[PDB]
Amino acid sequence: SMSVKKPKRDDSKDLALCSMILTEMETHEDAWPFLLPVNLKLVPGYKKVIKKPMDFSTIREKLSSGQYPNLETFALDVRLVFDNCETFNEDDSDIGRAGHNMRKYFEKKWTDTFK
Template sequence: MCTFCVLRASQSWRYPKQMTYQEALTCQISDHQLECQYLLLCLYHADEEHIAVADPCINVRNYTSVIKSPIWLDRVVEKLQQNLYQSVQHFVSDVLLIFTNCATFNRDNAEFRVMGERLKDLFEREFKSTFSIQLQHPTASNSQ
């Protein structure tokens, strides 16, 4: 079975204890490599147009004049494989930067902006599910 299938099938018993969003972010990446790989696979699978996969600096005109910190899924995979992330938070920050960059660059292109927003929503849902994030009380601070 592939990483995607193994993790999806084992989610219910891997983390019987729920944690907060902040607790998940502070976890060492070395203890959660499989979960991060699973999240990346979810994004690759959902990104049918491949808007977040490859280096946009190569094929997208004026990208670096608008985006100062380019990042894309293939680069996140490389960084994960090269153990360049110390915590889950560093990994999540790079993934979320992909969506921030997408929204910034495509502020006048609703089609691509919406695709990026859908991928971001998927990532956030899957992250919470994968790490058994407990739902916060509505009055709790939204520091997510």
């Protein structure tokens, strides 16, 4: 509260570390469904059903231009990528499996890096 603060967690490497994580996600072999925005002209249903589209290129641009106020807002966008994937794709499709694998990959790097 006013003039009563918890000790200061060092956040100065957060930007670099989120960049590194994102690079590792970008270069994974199962990243291909997630590298670019879904083409809303060519994929029936996507626009109306997925209220907040997200993809790795868009996360990379946001990261590079100071649009993440902290590491939790970055983790929310990454998880949004996988949540959207589960919303639109069957678990037993190549893309559905890709999405479960990538979420697992991400959550381990996240825990190892920050927790």
